């Protein structure tokens, strides 16, 4: 991204008050400069010995304060929805960003790049409820045999427990707190920190680790002034 | 065409067909001057006295 060397914060705000956008856009970029940098570029233009000139390239947003959403999916036994990713509401329609790279999240505020996004009707939201939504052909992934897995979402996880496999969800304090019968269960990241699915262990919550410290002591500069005894000498 | 049109609005979302030229920034630097002070001993006045 655009380093704090290439563009200071004073100068970024200097450029933001000059962008042809609305007070509502100007205010969103001032409060997510981290993301705006990760989305900006810096291209070296004219390099002379005694003066360097580069071109910064900031992002401009088309729409703001749209309601967005993100889709994770898991096998159903066997179905597996394959329209996974970020959905946002464009004007009238819905823009759909399928690669997890092009969309940045901070707090509760998503920033997506529209360069390769798909535009879908608002009726795809009806696919989550019924796979045979007659108002849209939900792209699905099928299979003639039992499958089992988990998929860790933003705020929890999904456990596809099917067949003779043995899946469970542990809690850090209480250990195993639920066994899973054959079905699609959803587990909250509040109660559960681990979900075992067979022989593979999924981690629903990040695991806190050792805290490291590197101590530094102030360095003392010392010198020794060289003083001559003139008074005893100016007497002799 | 990106010749005639620089913007296209579609509803409530604004697309930018052409890049928006911006403010030009400059960071000026002035030459740094090294200075020292040569130490000359009055030997001629000393070699006479």
């Amino acid at each position, epitope marked *: 991204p655009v380093s704090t060397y290439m563009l200071t914060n004073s100068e970024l*705000l*200097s450029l933001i*008050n000059d962008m042809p*956008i609305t*007070n509502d856009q*100007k*205010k969103l*970029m001032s409060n997510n400069v981290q993301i705006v940098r990760q989305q900006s570029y810096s291209i070296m233009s004219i390099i002379k010995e005694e003066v360097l000139a580069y071109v910064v390239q900031l992002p401009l947003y088309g729409v703001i304060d749209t309601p967005c959403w993100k889709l994770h999916t898991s096998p159903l036994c066997c179905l597996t929805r394959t329209d996974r990713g970020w959905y946002c509401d464009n004007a009238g329609s819905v823009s759909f960003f399928p690669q997890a790279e092009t969309c940045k999240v901070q707090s509760n505020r998503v920033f997506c790049d529209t360069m390769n996004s798909l535009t879908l009707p608002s009726e795809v939201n009806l696919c989550n409820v019924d796979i045979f939504n007659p108002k849209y052909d939900c792209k699905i992934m099928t299979s003639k045999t039992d499958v089992s897995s988990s998929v860790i979402t933003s705020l929890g996880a999904i456990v596809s427990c099917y067949g003779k496999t043995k899946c469970t969800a542990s809690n850090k304090n209480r250990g195993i707190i639920k066994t899973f019968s054959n079905g699609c269960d959803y587990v909250s990241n509040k109660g559960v920190d681990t979900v075992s699915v067979g022989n593979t262990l999924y981690y629903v919550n990040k695991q806190e680790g050792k805290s490291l410290y590197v101590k530094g002591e102030p360095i003392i500069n010392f010198y020794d002034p060289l003083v001559f005894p003139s008074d005893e000498f100016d007497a002799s | 065409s990106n010749k005639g049109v620089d913007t296209v609005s579609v509803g409530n979302t604004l697309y930018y067909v052409n890049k928006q030229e911006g*403010k030009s920034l400059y960071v000026k630097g002035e030459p740094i001057i090294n200075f020292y002070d040569p130490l000359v001993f009055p030997s001629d006045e000393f070699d006479a006295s």
Partner: antibody, heavy 117, light 109 residues
Framework: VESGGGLIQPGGSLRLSCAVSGFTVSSKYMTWVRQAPGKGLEWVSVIYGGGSTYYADSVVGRFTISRDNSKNTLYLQMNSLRAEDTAVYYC???????????????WGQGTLVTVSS | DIQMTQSPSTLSASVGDRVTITCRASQSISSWLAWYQQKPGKAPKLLIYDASSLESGVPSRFSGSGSGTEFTLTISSLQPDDFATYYCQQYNTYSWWTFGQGTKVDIKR
């Protein structure tokens, strides 16, 4: 602080000049507000740090906002003045620093422009 | 474009009173409403910006509140300092700034 206002016959031209001291004009957006006799405040024209200029509907095409880095003074060329343009023209900018756009806390003295035969 | 409308036309109040001027927006302007003081024959004086942040160095007796379409300017303890005309300003975008029509204030004494 302004100058260059005054009376000019309808259809004539007039040149305002906004003397600004304390800060550089080439790093902040500058604005023009006019005020009719006994009416409210009406925004007129604005120039941002990067040269973008915008004029309200009432005056667009007939006015021309510009600045010169040398004399550190933003102007406001007013061509084809009619009776309704007669008002007192204030210039303003924002001394302090933030990233929102619109408030003002330096305003000039205020110069009268009268259009009459 | 947006238009701002205040009430009333002229508001009378004595020294030390609590005065409340309102300013309404034809569109939700988020949090960008500025208040201005104009003593007759003078330049506008900035009291409040961004709905709620008070400009540093202006008496703390002035206060603002609200966001969206319903905004209010409230003075806690009135002074002879303040008797003048008050203006509200929307700045929801770059291109189009529009002012209030003004609330002119007199006294009882």
């Amino acid at each position: 602080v302004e100058s260059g206002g005054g009376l000019i016959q309808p259809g004539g031209s007039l040149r305002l000049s906004c003397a600004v001291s304390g800060f550089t004009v080439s790093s902040k957006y500058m604005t023009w507000v006019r005020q009719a006799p006994g009416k409210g405040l009406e925004w007129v024209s604005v120039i941002y740090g990067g040269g973008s200029t915008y004029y309200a509907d009432s005056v667009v095409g007939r006015f021309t906002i510009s600045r010169d880095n040398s004399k550190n003074t933003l102007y406001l060329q007013m061509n084809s003045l009619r009776a309704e343009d007669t008002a007192v023209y204030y210039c303003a900018s924002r001394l302090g620093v933030r990233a929102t756009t619109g408030d003002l806390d330096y305003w000039g003295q205020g110069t009268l422009v009268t259009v009459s035969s | 474009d947006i238009q701002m409308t205040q009430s009333p036309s002229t508001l009378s109040a004595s020294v030390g009173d609590r005065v409340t001027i309102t300013c309404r927006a034809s569109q939700s302007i988020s949090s960008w409403l500025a208040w201005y003081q104009q003593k007759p024959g003078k330049a506008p004086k900035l009291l409040i910006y961004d709905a709620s942040s008070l400009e540093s160095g202006v008496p703390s007796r002035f206060s603002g509140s609200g966001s969206g379409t319903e905004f209010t300017l409230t003075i806690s303890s009135l002074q002879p300092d303040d008797f003048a005309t008050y203006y509200c300003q929307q700045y929801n975008t770059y291109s189009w700034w529009t002012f209030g029509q003004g609330t002119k204030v007199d006294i009882k004494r």
